[PDB]
Amino acid sequence: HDAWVEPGAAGPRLLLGHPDDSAPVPPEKVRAVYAVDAQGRRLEATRGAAGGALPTSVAGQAAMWVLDVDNGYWSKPAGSTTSVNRPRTEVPGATSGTHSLKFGKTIVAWGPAVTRPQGLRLEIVPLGADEPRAGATLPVQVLWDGQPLPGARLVREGAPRDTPPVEADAEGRARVPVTGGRQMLTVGRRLPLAGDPRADTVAVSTNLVFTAR
Ligand code: NI
């Protein structure tokens, strides 16, 4: 599951799931959501209490949306295959468990502001400041804990499943092929976690969603 800001015909919305199969992010899972304007200024945003929508005034002037989601704890008993969203300390038969974090960035107006790192624990930062055409490559920097992540594996969600990931270079930089229309890039990491009874792994996913000219 990814958590992302989908740029729809009705305005941006917060989704959790997969591009063709998604549901709104539950409010209790949103740690932060905000926009950045074309001059780099942070714009606050919350979904409306009746209709669940992000504010039009912010959406219309956003350069990029940023989403930070705590997807909580996951585990499953020995002998099962599907994880449930409960910590291993409450699931008899579980011995491992994950704390799952999800981040998303959606670019809606290209310019210098979108190249500024936002401080997401795992982040894809565009190195291009121009709206990409299909067929171009978009250079990106992958960051982890605020520093380049050499060898990060970037997945093109629109490409066939069987496509090898784009591997970031020694500087954590990659030249990602741009496809037509709306597209999503993802990077994930799963790492050991010490000091949490409820999980021995921390899983982090991040994405960059954008639309080609
Ligand atoms: Ni999933």
Author numbering: 1 to 213
Can you quote the paper on this entry?
We report the method of signal strapping, where sequences of N-terminal signal peptides artificially appended with a histidine residue at their C-terminus are used to bootstrap a proteomic search. We exemplify the approach by the discovery and characterisation of four classes of bacterial metalloproteins, including two that we denote as anglerases reflecting their potential to capture transition metal ions from the bacterial environment. Structural and spectroscopic analyses confirmed that these proteins bind transition metals (Cu²⁺ or Ni²⁺) via N-terminal histidines.
At a 1:1 protein:metal molar ratio, the greatest thermal stabilisation was observed with Ni2+(ΔTm = + 7.0 °C), followed by Zn2+ (+ 4.6 °C), Co2+ (+ 4.0 °C) and Cu2+ (− 0.2 °C). The IsDUF4198 protein was co-crystallised with Ni²⁺ and its structure resolved at 1.4 Å resolution using molecular replacement. The IsDUF4198 structure features a cleft measuring ~ 12 × 20 Å, which houses the metal-binding site. Unlike the canonical T-shaped histidine brace seen in LPMOs, the three nitrogen donors in IsDUF4198 form a facially capping arrangement around the Ni²⁺ ion. This coordination geometry likely underlies the protein’s preference for Ni²⁺ over Cu²⁺—a notable inversion of the Irving–Williams series. Adjacent genes included TonB receptors and NikR_C family transcriptional regulators, both linked to nickel metabolism.
